[PDB]
């Protein structure tokens, strides 16, 4: 009758508000999962790639942290992936991975998982493996602590299957940690001053400030400074109302592009994002001289990485909100020149399409209140053309740059508004390639009936002399979809598009809608 | 006009016969793949799971080490788990990504892989990212070095993208090394008067054994010891005719179950297999007083783990031949009694059937040099009593036990049979959950045409109290199947099982066969 | 025409890391060459000395500090003092030398394969740089780790051929938070905690004094009008120990804190881990009825405590404002100033008592003079005789390693000189410790530096093997390292010494024979 480490963990779970579990069990997760409590909800995923990202969309949607378990060793390593990009968007996971029996782990016998701790290494804030049962709790609490203090990110913990069935030490302390740091105000100050000295500022607002809940203070900061406001290139978060006047559109992603794009100002006030996001190489100054920087991020490797500037280290939320009460509302500061984009309609057409035409009727039919999640990088000048983020919390792209993150990382999102009683569909773009890295996540969202709409991008390659292992012949998506359950249809015009678009915005579970479109 | 890095590691990776790369291609991979040599072939998996299992499959099958190719730490990432299972393989892999370029790397740029090195371990023999481009032509022979070095296993390179273009120090120095050691002759020597004198003896032969292509070898010595014959449990390679008079079966996955197995013994003699590959947990004895054992294998760590015994390191083909040699003919040894398969028919049968009648039905028609592949671990049994492997190389499973393993191996497996210049059929026997994990690696099947059979149990439900996650319903396989290009059908019965396994071994093309089971 | 060298001494000339401790050695000759005149080499006969002697001169000097170590073997040899750099939270940029990319991968004589692991666990980051041309970068990224909170040591390992290098131009010249602040909004939550306690105890520990907090500390401590407890096994001192709030160091076992925190109803502990615990003794974190709030600089230190509500945040910051935010309590009958139990054992003739060394000491031991403390076995005499009444003025190991005190003792003195403060060091240390960094005291007499190093010599550290010291001549010791020496009789001449050593010029070494406990 005593309490076991089982009964304790889970107690402890349900006080922390830990009571979803995202994973693919497996035996040595079986004395774990064993008389899973009443009021917990296990998510399974068919494959462990999908179960990390899916618990990442969940724990970005629901502003909570969330639990992944993971089979021993391999299905760890399935997981790596998906790891990584949990890990570059420092969102709060728990993985936890069943480990051979304390009883026998020293013969290293069959799915043991020796040296654990080193696997997730080096994309985890902290890997352990308990000295003993009676400090699982502990050490669950000890997980939870250091996901959730500043910079958020994921953790691993591994324990052995025969800990949970040990007599607890009894009930499991419950803690509470810091979840911000603010900026040394002393240095904050010394940053505005910076600022009201500027003749000609930029403002850059990038995944931090829509991850701190921070968009209306963003606003209220841009616009008292009065400066352009860039995004980040490559958002994986949008932080910023895409439709503001002073908007100026996302940075490009080279050296010698961002310098150019920065040498008409003399002041550049990054917040809450990299310094900077660069993808390929084209080589230039990472910053043009006669143009000063001044960042501002809630994670110290981001500071500690950046080529040039003065930094500080806050939640880029309050750093905000105290920045418009530092900085002087700036005399006459000229509006900056509107972004323009190039619109012009591929409406009607029959398929195949253009990407421009797909987003344009995508355009037309959205939900306002939609999210839309986006894996397709050969369409991000459509996306951007056609649907700008108007809405905190509703955008959503891989944190690594690795794709397979949103199919499963859509599912989790639509969990989570479910669970935190938010009515919204989600529309994910996904190029062709992408889809099929981890396809096997549509099975959950036709499971729990979930109100995505996946409108995949078939032009037959994957988005890029002579290069091998670029062409996608001989998929036929929609018999993938089916045959996992979810609705689907191949379109054929962009009548079809809209009108499928129309009714799976309707329908009761999640839609994949395939659009066969041009290279 | 200078040869760059890029045409040297092309010319030595030719002179080495690593002209195949598994792989999925992306941004950081590109100054790779650019320029692929035209005798080279370039293998694609939808997903990097599937690549590094295929690999291992086509690694094993040939005999040969073979090169994956992915993308930086996403892709790295996503091949963790089949990585796990090849390191435990003993697969000589080649592992390489792409990296960022040196040029900006410092500063953590989109898609970097900091810390490259360290992400894979523990599980590889060797992890390393060149001081210098003018190196890596150096770093590929070396990973060759090792990886081909007894134990065999993976090894991982990392590449920054920058470095194939730079100028070359000179061809590329081609080295050979040993593949194999001998066991020190006094101890083998010591070991075989051992043996001489026990009085009721027992021989294991494991995966070892067929993986140093030892199947005659070890046959000779066990028909001259006139001991029974025990295979490994849970076997990832069959190393002993199944149908020999002095065969076994395979040991016991418990410490009880083994200790109560060879008590009847007076010396356990494990040449190839771990000592022991003990599953769930069962306590005993790891030896009952008055057994002793004997170890023999060809990788130090499995000797160094085992809890009990006399062990020594050697190559087990060269250890078998020799023993041979050196022990006595025994005096009038009675010869073991007869292993008998408890078999009673299940055919003929109506969907949905047991898992006996399916692999009976597989008996009947499975060609006589069929390979077969196994990733359905609540039929074992079936397949112990209906498909016994009587041939080299000709059973492969998991090397690590984690699934998704067995599709992917397979197309390796027929791969690189026709790059061998072999002609036979790949039957997979695969459950239904397991079947999902990689179910993309099908497609590539379909595009290489390859003379494959994959009969999935559909039983509804994991292989495993209250435990959530084991339930499989609404798949409906077959569309899934024929959405990668596959030929497909759902079997009704026994007799329609036989006539698409008859129709399916005629087809030029793989064919996946859904047979509804028994839960 | 401007080499990676050329650029990363300018780069460090700017940050200050003008000081350089280490041992040179052939793969660090091409960082050294045309070592600047403007620029300090300390040299250490041991790579454990240079590393520790950089922990103190840090520490003293509120300033990072760089250190030069030889490729795997030296890195190796300095592992043990990293271990106490790194939980004192010091920042110390580490380096070492590498073997040239040119051959490196044929893992050549003193190459350091896969170096970035060596230091691991022990260091905040790592790193080999992918080309010459970003050293100069990785340096400003190494003081960048090193700095921001919490603070801590950083490795890098530099291809020996990566300094003769065109440089890409001059190195950008960064400059980062040194401090984060509590959320305010959770700071006035744990306020309104502590306003609602009947009977809070507050433990300020040694993140408090490397914060500069002392003031701070004393203003909020006196506001409150709590019990002040120190940490157990303190590495610093943060609250005067002659203050009547001050109730001493918490016991150093759960049971023993278990019972120490039961009158109160609420810990408030800043700057000090939950809990420095040492030897076990079993019992509950925490007794019921009393709840714990925890401010911490380091995520590290809250993220481990077995129980407790807790903030990260710069403890200074912290303090000074929590001072502004609680209530002035009302009807103050202040807590008894401790008290004492002082009994004299002098005069006495050795081998003496600890208890007549420490009153000895006591009684000459200028003001304002550094303590360095290294005796496990002497701590309760410390704290009978030698209060700590400044800030800034008691050191000791981070990590309890012994080792440490005698080259952290050079480094806090070199410190004092670079920054202009006059006052002496006078380190305690017991006759075991003394020996594993003996050779420390060469750089001590090399510079002539005022540090009297007061050697416990009792001949040990049962039935446990190992614990006997016999057949040591320490005094000859000292003296063939260079350093003034004197075997102490008694008392009377302890004092004696004690006073010639505090008027000469360069270190002493004086060998007390005292009675073992
Ligand atoms: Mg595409
Ligand atoms: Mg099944
Ligand atoms: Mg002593």
């Avoid at 499991?172 to 910076?194: G, M, N, Y």
């Amino acid at each position: 009758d005593q309490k076991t480490v089982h009964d304790v963990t889970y107690d402890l779970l349900r006080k922390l508000g830990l009571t979803t579990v995202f994973g693919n069990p497996g035996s040595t997760e079986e004395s774990f999962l064993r008389d899973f409590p009443e009021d917990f909800t296990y998510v399974l995923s068919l494959q462990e790639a999908s179960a990390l990202a899916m618990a990442d969309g969940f724990a970005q949607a629901t502003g909570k942290p969330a639990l992944v378990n993971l089979h021993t060793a391999a299905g760890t390593g399935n997981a790596m992936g998906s790891l990584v990009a949990a890990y570059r968007a420092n969102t709060p996971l728990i993985i936890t991975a069943g480990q051979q029996t304390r009883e026998m782990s020293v013969v290293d016998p069959y799915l043991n998982n020796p040296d654990a701790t080193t696997m997730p290494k080096p994309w985890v804030k902290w890997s352990y493996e308990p000295a003993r049962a009676e400090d699982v709790p502990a050490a669950f609490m000890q997980a939870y602590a250091v996901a959730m203090q500043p910079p958020m990110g994921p953790v691993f913990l591994s324990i052995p299957l025969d800990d949970w069935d040990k007599p607890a030490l009894g009930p499991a302390a419950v803690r509470s940690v810091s979840t911000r740091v603010a900026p040394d105000a002393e240095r904050l100050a010394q940053f505005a001053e910076r600022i009201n000295a500027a003749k000609h500022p930029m403002l850059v607002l990038g995944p931090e400030v829509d991850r701190a809940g921070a968009w209306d203070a963003g606003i209220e900061f841009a616009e008292k400074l009065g400066a352009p406001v860039h995004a980040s290139a490559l958002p994986d978060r949008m932080s910023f109302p895409e439709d503001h006047p002073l908007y100026a559109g996302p940075l490009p992603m080279t050296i010698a592009g961002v310098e150019q794009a920065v040498s008409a100002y003399d002041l550049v006030v990054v917040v809450g994002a990299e310094v900077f996001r660069y993808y390929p190489y084209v080589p230039g100054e990472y910053l043009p001289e006669g143009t000063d920087l001044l960042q501002i991020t809630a994670d110290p490797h981001r500071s500690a990485v950046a080529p040039v500037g003065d930094s500080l280290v806050g939640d880029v939320g309050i750093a905000l909100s105290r920045l418009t009460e530092l900085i002087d509302t700036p005399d006459d500061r000229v509006p900056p020149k509107p972004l323009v984009r190039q619109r012009h309609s591929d409406i009607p057409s029959t398929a195949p399409m253009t990407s421009n035409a797909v987003y344009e009727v995508l355009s037309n039919v959205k939900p306002d209140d939609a999210a839309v999640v986006m894996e397709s990088t050969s369409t991000m000048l459509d996306l951007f053309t056609w649907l700008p983020t108007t809405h905190p919390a509703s955008f959503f792209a891989t944190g690594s740059g690795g794709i397979g993150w949103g199919v499963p990382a859509a599912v989790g999102i639509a969990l989570g508004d479910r669970a935190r009683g938010v009515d919204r569909t989600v529309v994910a773009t996904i190029g062709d390639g992408s889809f099929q890295y981890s396809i096997q996540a549509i099975w959950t969202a036709a499971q729990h009936k979930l109100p995505i709409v996946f409108v995949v991008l078939r032009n037959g390659e994957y988005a890029i002399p002579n290069v091998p292992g670029l062409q996608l012949p001989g998929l036929d998506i929609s018999s993938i979809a089916a045959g996992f359950g979810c609705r689907t249809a191949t379109v054929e015009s962009t009548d079809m598009l809209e009108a499928e678009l129309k009714t799976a915005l309707q329908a009761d579970g999640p839609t994949v809608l395939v659009v066969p479109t041009l290279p």
